[PDB]
Ligand SMILES: C=C(C)[C@@H]1CC[N@H+]2CCC[C@@H](C)[C@]2(C)C1
Ligand SMILES: C=C(C)[C@@H]1CC[N@H+]2CCC[C@@H](C)[C@]2(C)C1
């Protein structure tokens with residue numbers, strides 16, 4: 180799959196080697212892997228590497244928190260595939276009071292204490308900004324087991340749902356926390372079109388690269404948890420083409436979203452509405468889009 | 484607007500100039516044009532030229548019937564844009580018994596006697612093949628004023644509907660008539676999938692090139708008759724991008740349908756199922772697709 184031309188230059192956090200070793204090492208000590216094959220596949224995914232490509236301008240003392248959070252969410256994302264919608268919802272819901280710090284974890288259950296200790300450590304570092312990531316994470320968790328996944332969706336409907344299932348808002352709040360980038364309610368409200376556009380590009384670039392993995396999962400994992408819900412399948416069905424053809428067409432649409440990001444950014448600035456915080460923010464989203472694509476193209480999670 | 488590469492090479496009927504003069508001449512004689520500007524615009528469109536690009540292997544003594552049929556359907560297609568759905572339906576329904584020859588025309592009304600005399604002349608030339616074009620024409624006519632046009636559609640539902648509104652079946656029956664190409668019911672059943680794929684290409688290439696004309700009509704003509712119903716707007720709305728962006732993506736999808744055509748024809752031949760008639764037929768479909776594109780990208784109908 181030859182990607183169409185992009186003007187976006189991906190950037191990777193400078194501490195990726197040291198932080199990846201630290202965070203992978205942490206999960207290798209604490210998380211319950213089924214076998215050595217799984218431990219190896221985990222390290223091969225490079226979950227801290229993707230986090231560093233998402234947030235290349237994170238503060239040096241904050242990037243590890245983001246890596247830990249996205250890593251545990253990737254691990255859970257995979258566990259949910261073997262669960263019903265009801266079981267997966269129960270699993271996620273138990274973690275929500277624990278994430279808030281309202282309920283102590285069972286220390287015999289790694290996901291519980293990993294989640295508790297992580298969020299405790301984020302609030303210890305920056306309470307106000309850590310708290311702002313909680314509701315975005317919960318909205319994402321609740322979308323993951325939403326019954327609407329078992330109903331036919333068109334492309335527009337899917338993209339609207341997928342903004343939650345892809346964790347767009349949690350990634351935004353996490354980016355801001357990791358950069359120490361504070362924005363006012365007025366500033367946040369101003370960039371909602373840019374956010375929605377960026378969400379489509381993240382979602383579809385992921386759908387493109389993750390399709391083979393997800394198709395296999397739909398044939399082998401749980402009938403609800405493993406259900407094939409992706410733009411690749413939707414466009415293939417609507418246009419009556421193969422999945423490979425649908426990827427090529429969707430990648431061209433991703434580049435139209437890149438152009439639209441640039442146009443909206445130029446418009447924010449030409450309307451006199453671009454603040455220094457917002458300029459940092461929308462450039463940050465550009466790194467999410469290009470970082471996600473670069474990792475998705477290289478990671479063994481999708482190629483194997 | 485840069486077309487992506489295509490391996491389909493268009494062909495034009497050898498007698499295109501003389502038949503164009505004969506057929507344009509007949510309509511300039513009989514049809515109720517409102518003024519000289521409209522007569523000029525009519526010749527400028529090149530309706531016999533597109534018919535000769537659609538059916539470049541038509542028999543020399545049948546190509547004119549096809550030019551006359553498509554010419555009158557183009558003229559009616561434009562009249563409907565100034566009508567409500569109800570008025571358009573009443574207008575088309577009047578012509579259906581006349582087309583069958585069951586009801587005599589009012590000779591003071593050009594569309595009625597043009598339609599009556601044309602179908603009488605085609606039945607005199609080849610009764611059985613001319614009869615096979617009637618119901619596909621009527622299916623197309625009914626789609627043109629269907630209320631479904633004014634209700635939300637996704638890309639898949641649009642293409643399903645637009646196979647009727649674009650006249651895919653009448654064009655296939657007309658192609659067979661013009662070539663004297665007789666296929667059995669079992670032969671036609673073998674290429675159903677190839678026909679469905681070819682309809683999407685014809686529809687979307689037309690949509691891409693005729694969008695500016697249709698956008699203008701939508702703002703100036705009847706709010707129902709001239710309603711903007713096209714893949715360019717559907718995709719733009721589903722993906723939240725501009726019409727120009729949608730056209731670029733759709734054009735890539737058209738090349739996927741060309742690859743699919745080639746794959747399906749290859750399989751038909753590989754399974755020992757491509758008869759000489761079917762080989763002529765599928766090659767005929769390819770000329771429709773490339774001919775449509777060449778005319779759409781050059782006709783003054785779409786550029787002015
Ligand atoms: C498409 C993306 C930006 C990521 C794809 C993988 N998932 C897995 C679970 C956590 C999500 C925020 C995300 C990293 C989003
Ligand atoms: C896309 C096509 C094959 C043709 C485009 C133009 N319209 C005009 C009105 C009558 C239609 C059958 C058609 C010739 C279809």
Ligand SMILES: [Mg+2]
Pocket residue numbers: 256323344
């Ligand atoms: Mg998921």
Ligand SMILES: [Mg+2]
Pocket residue numbers: 256257
């Ligand atoms: Mg997943």
Ligand SMILES: [Mg+2]
Pocket residue numbers: 385386389390393
């Ligand atoms: Mg995926």
Ligand SMILES: [Mg+2]
Pocket residue numbers: 560627648
């Ligand atoms: Mg029409």
Ligand SMILES: [Mg+2]
Pocket residue numbers: 560561
């Ligand atoms: Mg029209």
Ligand SMILES: [Mg+2]
Pocket residue numbers: 689690693694697
């Ligand atoms: Mg059109």
